[PDB]
Design a binder for this molecule. Sequence first.
Ligand code: ADP
Ligand code: ADP
Ligand code: CRB
Ligand code: CRB
Ligand code: CL
Ligand code: ZN
Ligand code: ZN
Lengths: 388, 388
Amino acid sequence: PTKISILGRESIIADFGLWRNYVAKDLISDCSSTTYVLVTDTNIGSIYTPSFEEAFRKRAAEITPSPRLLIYNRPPGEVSKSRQTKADIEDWMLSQNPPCGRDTVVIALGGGVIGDLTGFVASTYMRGVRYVQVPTTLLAMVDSSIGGKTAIDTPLGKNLIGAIWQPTKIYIDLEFLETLPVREFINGMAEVIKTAAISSEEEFTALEENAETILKAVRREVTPGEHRFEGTEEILKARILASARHKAYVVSADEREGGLRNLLNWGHSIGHAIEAILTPQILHGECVAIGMVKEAELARHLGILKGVAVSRIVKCLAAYGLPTSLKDARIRKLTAGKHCSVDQLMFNMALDKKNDGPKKKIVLLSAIGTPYETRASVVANEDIRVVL
Amino acid sequence: PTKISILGRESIIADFGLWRNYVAKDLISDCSSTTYVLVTDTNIGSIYTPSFEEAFRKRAAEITPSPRLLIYNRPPGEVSKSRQTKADIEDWMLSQNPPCGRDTVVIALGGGVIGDLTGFVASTYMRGVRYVQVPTTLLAMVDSSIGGKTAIDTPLGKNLIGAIWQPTKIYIDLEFLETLPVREFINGMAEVIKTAAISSEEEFTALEENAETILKAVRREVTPGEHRFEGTEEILKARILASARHKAYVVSADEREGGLRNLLNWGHSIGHAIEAILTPQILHGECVAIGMVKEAELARHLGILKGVAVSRIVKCLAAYGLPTSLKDARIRKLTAGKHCSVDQLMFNMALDKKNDGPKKKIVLLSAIGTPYETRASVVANEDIRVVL
Ligand SMILES: Nc1ncnc2c1ncn2[C@@H]1O[C@H](COP(=O)(O)OP(=O)(O)O)[C@@H](O)[C@H]1O
Ligand SMILES: Nc1ncnc2c1ncn2[C@@H]1O[C@H](COP(=O)(O)OP(=O)(O)O)[C@@H](O)[C@H]1O
Ligand SMILES: O=C(O)[C@]1(O)C[C@H](CP(=O)(O)O)[C@@H](O)[C@H](O)C1
Ligand SMILES: O=C(O)[C@]1(O)C[C@H](CP(=O)(O)O)[C@@H](O)[C@H](O)C1
Ligand SMILES: [Cl-]
Ligand SMILES: [Zn+2]
Ligand SMILES: [Zn+2]
């Protein structure tokens, strides 16, 4: 079992089968409380909550008095990361008998949507309650669940309202990947690739080599019993952990994005601008993949990044089934009639939280695994437009 | 020009005439930014924002590139502390040209409503922006503005959702009191009295000695534009400062209310339960005054507080024009047909943020200026019912 520390605390426990046999117990011993609220959507719930309710009663039978478990299920989709859902969830908790108090321990069981949402609710519930992350997707395991960033979407853009609330525990259970849809898995690989590109050429090269093997396992059939990733697990764990460990480091050194944390946003300046236009038809990771390509092209444009690097980024993202341009085949049919104007994209980048005033900040890599600055660089509009 | 230090920083500056000739300048020097957002209601705005716009341009004229000042006027009343107003202010900020970014400095110009609201918006705007407090009401000057506690109301109770976001600066300008309605001033005295009752019998005695004088300066009939509190200001400043300084201390020693900070909630366990029923017809301070009386009666019931003390708290609150019972004359006609059932009050105390699980907690004074515990004490329902 791997333990990664973040911000002076060992909130990260990684292993296989945690959900089934560890989270239930650990929660009741390290997160003493009379109330526990489980948040997840209908898809993840029907598959994973049942087993937990039992694991819960079992470990709560021994504690006096016995705490309680309350399960909230919301409509799966990047459409629940909103004000209304966060409102219903809060009201719901408040209507409970007895109500859910400041000792409430909230459990985020899901990907980035449920994670971002659950964590935000927890940050403002009665001004703050404890919560834990149980990332069930790849993207949430290698990125979203770590770091304490949470938020919701408003009609204008992505993650415009939120809070930096660190979760008390973060349980990374690789077993969840067994049931994660193919698209989702690829989608999350965008983040893994991104994390490697800003940290080490070694890790990136590793990811390039793992391509075929990893991709062949994800597409595999699997019969009720054996686990996909049969014979590729050591590789998987190694890659996932590398991503998680690096994020932990960055977050530790600059929790509130005073500068260094900007780097975790590589590909997101353009990615988010695009995502605000093509969501929900297009997933986060898929948009970020295209954003990494355009931001990379921008770095070459500025004479910061070498062309050979731009091509290698594209080839790597392509090798994982990720799109590398807004003209991509799949992405074309999925939008149906949606297209990004250079104007809209520029309008949305004005909304980039990294911006310092009206100065747009984008992460520029000077080379694979080597950022240009230890923060986002100020870039002029005209230069952005050229790659759009 | 007095300065108080809170949570390791002298963010509190108190004097007369700060708004007119200081806030403007200090903001531009200590809160460097390209964007400043002023939030206030129509009542306080028409009286106080004009003078500031001028003071602003004046001190921003030397600054290049020119920074901007955007203004948001919400409707007066507790009605503004809602999920919607917070969503309106937010969608507004996000909609300016260019959008309000993470360098935005938000200015809270108002009492507890505008303070709690503005501060909460700031806490979650793009995950957190800077903000300052310009308390225009007595209550806010002596309590709500200091401490970082911010929140909004939901159909179920008071301050159920919010955040602990410390303001960068807190400007206490006594000049605002000149135009504060009589009811408001009295309303805030409830907090002053409360702060003294949990800190010192000395301060609490000077309060008793100043009732006649303070209240006479307050009730005096004046024409628009002329002042009061003439020949009593040294007294006023002294009392206000004492309350602010004490809150500063408490908040510093237990920022996120884990223990100590419970004491600042004396009279609020019952006060909030009542306020959730009689609002908005009844003001916070007026509800807290009745809450202090009943909580004190409760302390005597438990054999913690001496009867002579309870009858001194009553006499003091009465001396300020504050109610001491739900049967009060003014409070009877103001509710019109509203009355608090004992079962209802109990229900509303279930939602009290201080409760450890289902265990209601209340602040018990063992004597004037001396709490029973350095935190809220656990009290049984049956004992609460007896003072209801
Ligand atoms: N372990 C899992 N197995 C099955 N369905 C899952 C799993 N993880 C999440 N899902 C479903 O996958 C979809 C995408 O997850 P989401 O949290 O929105 O994305 P991400 O984590 O990529 O931000 C959702 O419809 C959700 O219900
Ligand atoms: N100094 C002032 N002069 C004029 N009206 C004021 C002043 N301060 C605020 N007000 C008005 O006082 C009322 C009560 O203030 P509010 O912030 O709602 O409560 P409090 O500060 O007592 O919690 C509001 O209607 C507001 O518009
Ligand atoms: O700081 C972080 O953890 C992130 O940059 C945070 C972003 C979301 P944000 O740009 O809204 O902060 C997330 O999508 C990215 O994968 C990681
Ligand atoms: O801790 C505080 O600052 C307070 O207890 C905060 C409360 C509001 P809360 O009980 O909703 O936290 C306020 O009414 C009181 O005067 C002071
Ligand atoms: Cl919110
Ligand atoms: Zn991302
Ligand atoms: Zn109060």
